[PDB]
């Protein structure tokens, strides 16, 4: 299923699917490296 990713260099938003994409590319700047962004869910951290 389609997922959300962020570019390594330009930090923009890039959407693609790994199971189908035969060539990972950032369409805005051509970077071959992408990040997986933090999910938007709350997490609990103990302050100890």
């Amino acid at each position: 299923v389609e997922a959300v990713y962020r570019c390594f260099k330009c930090g923009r938003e890039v959407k693609l699917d790994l199971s189908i994409t035969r060539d990972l590319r950032c369409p805005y700047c051509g970077s071959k490296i992408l990040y997986k962004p933090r999910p938007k869910v709350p997490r609990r951290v103990k302050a100890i």
Partner: protein, 65 residues
Amino acid sequence: MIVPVRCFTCGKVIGDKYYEFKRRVEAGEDPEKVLDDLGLERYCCRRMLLSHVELIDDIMHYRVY
């Protein structure tokens, strides 16, 4: 990397006095007089302000998302 909030030994809050101390010392004032003015008599507190490094600016430029 940023200034500690409290002195490690006695727990006194010294987090907010670092920038004041740095700016006053850069102006050429006597560091001992500045520290006495700020109200740090025990050397345990003075060490935290004297030996600190501000590395947050150096490490801030690389982002991870």
